[PDB]
Amino acid sequence: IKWKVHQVVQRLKDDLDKNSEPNGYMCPICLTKYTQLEAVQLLNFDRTEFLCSLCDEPLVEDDSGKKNKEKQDKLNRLMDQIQPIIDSLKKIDDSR
């Protein structure tokens, strides 16, 4: 249980830390993930759309930057739910 809760805390915290950063870009043709810093060099000659190396197709920004507050809220609500478990673990650490 201790390893499970610690892995939940660390995985959700790192997921929240990543998801607080903005999205990146999506190519609907090849259906693959892209990041903003990877898309820095994906600008075209005229800075209008984000050019694709394979599809030569514009890149559109994903929908996860507003999932920052959703991951935060899930973390907080789950933390509230497991707070009796955290208190019980504290009392176990008090005990033998």
Partner 1 sequence: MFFIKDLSLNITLHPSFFGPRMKQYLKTKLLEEVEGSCTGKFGYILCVLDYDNIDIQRGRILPTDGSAEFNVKYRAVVFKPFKGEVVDGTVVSCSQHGFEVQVGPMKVFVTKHLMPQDLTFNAGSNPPSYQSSEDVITIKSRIRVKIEGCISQVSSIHAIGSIKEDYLGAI
Partner 2 sequence: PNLNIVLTCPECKVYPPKIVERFSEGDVVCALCGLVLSDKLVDTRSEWRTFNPLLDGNNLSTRIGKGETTDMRFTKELNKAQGKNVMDKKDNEVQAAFAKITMLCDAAELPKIVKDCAKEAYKLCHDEKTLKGKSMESIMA
Answer with the entry of partner 2, partner 1, none that 28 interacts with (C-beta below 5 to 8 A by kind).
none
Q: Binder to partner 2 among 54, 66, 94, 96 (CB under 8 A)?
A: 54
Torsion sign across C-alpha atoms 5, 17, 61, 30 = negative
Produce one character per residue of 25-42: b if its CB has 16 or more CB atoms within 10 Å, e if not.
bbbeeeeeebeeeebeeb
Instruction: Supply the minimum distance, in Å, between the C-beta of residue 50 and partner 1.
Output: 12
Interaction residues for partner 1, span 4-43 (CB under 8 A): 21-22, 36-37, 40-41
